[PDB]
Amino acid sequence: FTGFFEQNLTAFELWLKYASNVRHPPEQLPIVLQVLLSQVHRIRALVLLSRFLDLGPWAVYLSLSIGIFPYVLKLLQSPAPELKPILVFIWARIMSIDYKNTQSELIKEKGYMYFVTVLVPTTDEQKAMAVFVLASFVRNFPLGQKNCFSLELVNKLCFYIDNSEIPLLRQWCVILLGLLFADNPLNRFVCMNTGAVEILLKSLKDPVPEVRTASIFALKHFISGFQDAEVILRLQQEFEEQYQQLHSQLQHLQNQSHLQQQQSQQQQQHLEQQQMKIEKQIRHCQVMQNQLEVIDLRKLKRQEIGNLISILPLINDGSSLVRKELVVYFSHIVSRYSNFFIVVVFNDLLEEIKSQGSIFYTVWKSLLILAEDPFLENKELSKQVIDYILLELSAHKELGGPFAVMEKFLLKPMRTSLAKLFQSLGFSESSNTSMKSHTSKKGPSGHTEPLQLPLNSSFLDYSREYFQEPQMKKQEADEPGSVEYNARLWRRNRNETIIQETQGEKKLSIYGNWSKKLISLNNKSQPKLMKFAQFEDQLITADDRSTITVFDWEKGKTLSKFSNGTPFGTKVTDLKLINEDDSALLLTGSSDGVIKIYRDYQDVDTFKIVSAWRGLTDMLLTPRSTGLLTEWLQIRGSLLTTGDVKVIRVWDAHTETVEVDIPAKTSSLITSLTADQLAGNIFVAGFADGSLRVYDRRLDPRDSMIRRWRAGNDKQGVWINNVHLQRGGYRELVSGATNGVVELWDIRSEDPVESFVMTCMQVHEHAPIIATGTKQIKIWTTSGDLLNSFKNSAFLSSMAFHPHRMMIAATNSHDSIVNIYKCED
Amino acid sequence: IFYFDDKRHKTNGNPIPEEDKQRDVNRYYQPITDWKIMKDRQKTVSAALLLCLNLGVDPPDVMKTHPCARVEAWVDPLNFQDSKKAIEQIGKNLQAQYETLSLRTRYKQSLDPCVEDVKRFCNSLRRTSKEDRILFHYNGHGVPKPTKSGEIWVFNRGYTQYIPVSLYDLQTWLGAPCIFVYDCNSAENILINFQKFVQKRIKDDEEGNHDVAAPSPTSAYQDCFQLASCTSDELLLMSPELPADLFSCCLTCPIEISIRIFLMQSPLKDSKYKSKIPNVNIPGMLSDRRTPLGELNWIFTAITDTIAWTSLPRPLFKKLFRHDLMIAALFRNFLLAKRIMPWYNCHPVSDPELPDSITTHPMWKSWDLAMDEVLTKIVID
Amino acid sequence: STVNSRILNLLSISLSGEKFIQSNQQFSIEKARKSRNQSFMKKTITDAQILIQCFKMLQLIHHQYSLTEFVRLITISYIEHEDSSVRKLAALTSCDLFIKDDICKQTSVHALHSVSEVLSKLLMIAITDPVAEIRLEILQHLGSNFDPQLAQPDNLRLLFMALNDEIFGIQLEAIKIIGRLSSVNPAYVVPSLRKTLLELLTQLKFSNMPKKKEESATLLCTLINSSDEVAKPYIDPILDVILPKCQDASSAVASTALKVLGELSVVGGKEMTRYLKELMPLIINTFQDQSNSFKRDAALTTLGQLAASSGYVVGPLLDYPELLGILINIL
Amino acid sequence: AKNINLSEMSSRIVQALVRILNNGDRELTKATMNTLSLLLLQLGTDFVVFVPVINKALLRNRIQHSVYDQLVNKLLNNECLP
């Protein structure tokens, strides 16, 4: 025989490797389809076919408009451990684009058993492919719900979600249960009894947010059922029919076997195993049939109302993804249990003008809490959720007159009528720490035009779209050479040269001058938040009006000037940078605890808000509030945040969960905080009462306190301007006070190391200097000796340094002019 | 490692927008919505093998050389005397060869027919197969060449006078689903005659409203497929090297004559096992795969599918190659005919016309090399 | 970097008016003459000397900066000035900017289509340029790193029409390129190799002119050396023509025929157990008693390949006890 | 060239015809233009490799014709009519 097949396989390999940049047909596809028939090269042909299928949705379309579906159906019946991962990968690829037309071809010859036995008898990635295939089979296919739902499968699913490492299966198992809970009271009863509900309730608290959103999606599906009294009969009928049909087939096969022929080692020997296989299927049928009659819709409702209260504490979650999934779940709860909402809104807003007390009022208040989200789309999404309620009580048939009467109070018998509707659903029914805490600094003033009340949830389509990006080959921007790769290497070279030149020019600041001005800019307002970008030449400023402005000082240009979107009366209290090594992101922290992250801040046209949450919740807007005080620690990804709350919290970024809370053990406010950027375990905070304290995260939060001292020998509480630990050099802990006293301390020892002699004290990150803000700007050595003094032609607002170059920024109180001074020789 | 820069943060949870879906910029989402066949299968179940071969006498309209093309379906008419091969051997071999394409189709042949015979020979097939396809294979060599008015010829009981039959009456005899295979000396005449009779029936059934009583629905005559030997008024080849029914050999047994015409047209004819028709015997069966003959059939199937997919537009490829196996195999062989036959001043024709890149496609060289590789093993054995 | 950046900027402003950058934010190539005309009058026609001098450094002085982007200037500067030197030097500068691994063997979008574009442009100017001395070396300097990009059928189809060209050196190197590609993408190479082998074998015996015979014979030599995959099964047809080519038409045709025979023997090797008995008498017939004192180097070298490749070493003296008689007096 | 393909020998044919076209004869020009245009019909979209040198020689010798101009600038914007 000829070597034509091998030659064409090699040609297809080269086309896959080096010629795939054009997305036109490969011209060698019928050959690799034809070689899929003989056990000489099926493994190699199938792996090249899967490699082709990896590229994208054009590949699977070309492979389906040629006829690979009969082949991949036919290889299911051939058993071999080596083909199993390749078949499951190919099927996972093929069912992620057109699952509508490929789900009825898997029920013909027990084709689901392949995926069922590769899941339940092989890496976790293979198991993830298998569970995705099963979920795509079950989606909107109630005939396949019957075939797929087995107790062994759900128990193995619970085992995997208890302990499987890779989060992809931790996603898809929860998705599979959510899809199995679609509309099936028998399935809901069985899962409740076997305790998958408890496991999926405990899986709410998990590091990655995708599985948390998946858990909320599954408990969205876990609503009991509106057409329950008819769907239970609607399932009873075909269980009866399947029982009758399989029973008739059993006696038909018995009459066939009663042919008065032994047929040893023949069809009879091939028939006894089918006999008790049919018997096992029958016995499964009456197991489900016996579980049917004890359904207890009341216990189903009780478990649902027990799940809702445990859903509630994820209001202070991390991402806007989980928040959007929460608001759509709340909208579906509004859709189902409408009349409770209708009877509670009257009482709540009449009391706002002037029964409640249930866990339902907690959800009603949480909807209003989500109505003030810091994200863009979530705000109008919650508004559209509440718009159904508004439109309903606008009339409520006979109630529109009373509603208007109590609506005229908004600018400034019916009791029994409202009370009667509570029992109408209380009868149909047939710890509780509501705790009602909310900073009510705002009030609800009462793109699609209409509103469908049960909202959609595109999370399933989002999760399905993951299976089109490549998996056997790394994606764009991470290849060994590309546009983004070349940009990354250019950025890396620039960081290297700036870092080297900073070490080269470190000593120039000791003996140089500081009295020369570089450039002055007009911010059209008084700025107090003032930050040079660490490496690239930009300058971020923020003022009272939450108007954030970006300057390019090299060209003396204004790049952007926008608004933070914070409500009036609050002020932005901190600006910081995220991922400074590759592409920085502006973090704006305002006195209301609203943390936002911005992208492309240097362009007005293409700026975006990536993420937004509330790291802190319990602060009270005092007139003397220090606001949101935050510090960054990149290696651990830690964000330490504090303010009017008596506890400094840590926020993680890889899990978006609160790792730990550390009490301040005082009653004063916090003026400053700093931490070590490389070791990432010791952080020092300076408090307005003149107390300098060192904490540790390695121990428990109760004894996280290590050491405490007082700045100066005076017993009176002296205000502290700033406490700083330098990143480089010798890392001298420099602490300044408003009386002019500046100090150099040690963490290990107790007595201060050095001291000498007020708006703010600033320290350059690598230059051994200390800058003191008075009517005359003074720059000193960290060893105490003065170096220079000049005037910024009142009181200074704040100074800052460019973190590597010797740029110092100055601005005066009641002044809109900001000056930059450059150190030279 | 860098944070706050993952898929969740850059996508917000929304899926890929549908308004951006169809504006394919990187050509990444090119769709084929109608990918799955609708399971509507027009099977072929019955065949008519019209073989108008009265061996010994020639038509009076075509001159002949004293040695002429006379072998028919690999059986010679001189080794058998008068009528043991006039039908009952040629038709037997032809039916056995047609069995390879589809074994689930029954066949029943023609004994040099007459009009009172092709009454039943067509109407029984029509009444026993309602909407399934009926194959019709006409071979004519003892028959005058078809006329421009649309007639073929058959015989009488005494085999004396050639009697005409109109293609209009023939298509009323049969019904809608056809595959017609012609082997006469000018088949383009009857192909265009059938085309214009079909449009005449369309016009008379639609506008004139005088619907003639036809056994099959009016609009279903368009599914009737046709394959024809000669593209114009150009005569076949009477050369005594090649068989007289080269088109039917192309459409029936591809591997055999394709190998033998490769032996005909090989630049080298020395160092080979020899009007000298070579005696190429290849071991194995068509349906096998490990045998050399089965391997040759397999590689032929692959290459003639690849050429068709590369050249043809997609709707025509779906209509002709994916719907049913019998028609797929016949057009697979027609792809080989469209290359082999034009080497001998005869151009085949199909009723759904095919692009002419088939005969100049570069991929045939690999098939030629495959024959060379197998035949080297044969000669060294 | 204080001086190399300056010389790169001088080269820039000489070629087209911008500054060499890798990726921060570039322009096209139309204002080259407008930028370069004021250049010489800023210090103080043909203008070939300035471009030649500016091109003579890109092949010589190495720069650690990114070096695969100003090829998009150089390749568009091919026919900027008509010459047998400007085009050749620009093409070889573009060819020497891609040697082993700069953007060549890394696989990604914008790391692969740039290579495809530059290789297509080089092949186009390699087969299009009328002056028949650019293409004797612009095809020759194609290193083995462009094989996965030019082995595709789209470039291969335009490549093997260079097998029939004017100068014989073009054919001699193009068939070697084809033989090298005969193991990269063999599905689209080997049948075409069979076709051209059959064409050459037909012409070698149906042609009647000694220079055509010469070209066919040594084309067969270089093909049989450059590709061993298309070699072995065709030994009988390729020997049935060459073996009866020891005539007296000229000495060179017989020498090249013996060269073909020796190359075929050394390429095949050890399957001539059923050719040696007929092969040895015919070669010793032209090895001894020459009618004219022709070039016997080929007659020596053919046995030099064939005896060693066959391994029939101690036998021939016993079967043919005359070769001692030839060897004693040939010296 | 109407009957036997010449993608194989196109380089030799075109480089032989260019030396004809370079020196003006005013009578052979129409015939050689017709022959090269017919080979363009035979070859098709692949003639983009041979477009620029032919254009350069034609612009040098100042020879223009309607059929060649129309079919070439239809070839560039992809509308081929035999």
Side-chain angles (χ1 to χ4, degrees), chain A residues 101 171 179 273 290 367 415 514 566 666 687 717 720 726:
Chain A
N101 291 318
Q171 182 66 41
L179 286 164
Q273 76 269 23
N290 288 319
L367 197 62
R415 65 179 64 88
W514 293 82
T566 75
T666 185
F687 288 68
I720 284 165
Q726 303 169 289

Side-chain angles (χ1 to χ4, degrees), chain A residues 23 34 61 66 105 462 579, chain B residues 3 11 30 36 298 322:
Chain A
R23 303 185 179 265
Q34 272 307 309
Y61 279 154
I66 198 64
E105 281 56 20
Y462 174 110
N579 285 324
Chain B
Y3 292 164
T11 52
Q30 57 189 358
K36 165 177 181 170
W298 191 14
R322 301 277 105 192

Side-chain angles (χ1 to χ4, degrees), chain B residues 224-245:
Chain B
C224 194
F225 290 141
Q226 288 183 113
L227 304 169
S229 315
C230 301
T231 192
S232 284
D233 49 356
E234 61 76 20
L235 183 63
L236 281 174
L237 276 296
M238 284 73 74
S239 55
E241 271 305 357
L242 61 83
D245 62 13

Side-chain angles (χ1 to χ4, degrees), chain A residues 243-259 269-353 355-387:
Chain A
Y243 175 72
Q244 179 63 39
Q245 183 62 255
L246 197 51
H247 186 273
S248 190
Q249 194 251 329
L250 174 67
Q251 279 96 25
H252 281 55
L253 194 152
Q254 282 188 332
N255 300 350
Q256 279 170 1
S257 305
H258 275 291
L259 73 165
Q269 269 75 34
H270 289 71
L271 269 163
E272 293 91 7
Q273 76 269 23
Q274 284 168 14
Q275 286 162 228
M276 73 290 291
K277 183 177 183 293
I278 289 155
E279 293 179 353
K280 281 195 279 310
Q281 293 178 267
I282 297 169
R283 86 189 176 180
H284 183 110
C285 177
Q286 70 264 12
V287 175
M288 331 285 278
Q289 267 198 348
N290 288 319
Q291 303 264 300
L292 294 175
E293 67 263 28
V294 294
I295 179 66
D296 185 324
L297 197 150
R298 160 202 56 240
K299 204 182 71 143
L300 276 161
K301 168 59 175 280
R302 175 60 204 176
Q303 192 85 299
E304 175 265 335
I305 211 66
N307 290 6
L308 164 75
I309 59 170
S310 305
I311 294 297
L312 294 174
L314 284 190
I315 176 63
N316 314 287
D317 50 1
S319 78
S320 283
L321 173 66
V322 192
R323 278 179 189 87
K324 192 178 75 58
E325 173 55 40
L326 192 65
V327 304
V328 307
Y329 171 86
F330 284 166
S331 186
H332 302 179
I333 285 294
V334 173
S335 176
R336 184 71 90 91
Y337 296 148
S338 171
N339 293 12
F340 277 113
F341 276 109
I342 309 308
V343 67
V344 74
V345 288
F346 305 146
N347 296 115
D348 193 24
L349 63 86
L350 69 87
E351 284 176 356
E352 281 177 1
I353 285 148
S355 282
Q356 289 180 356
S358 171
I359 54 177
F360 187 69
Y361 199 55
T362 316
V363 187
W364 160 241
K365 191 61 66 68
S366 294
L367 197 62
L368 272 298
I369 284 166
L370 283 149
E372 313 167 75
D373 267 334
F375 202 71
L376 301 163
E377 283 83 1
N378 258 323
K379 186 180 289 293
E380 74 259 14
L381 212 51
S382 282
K383 182 83 180 173
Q384 296 300 320
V385 175
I386 208 62
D387 199 37

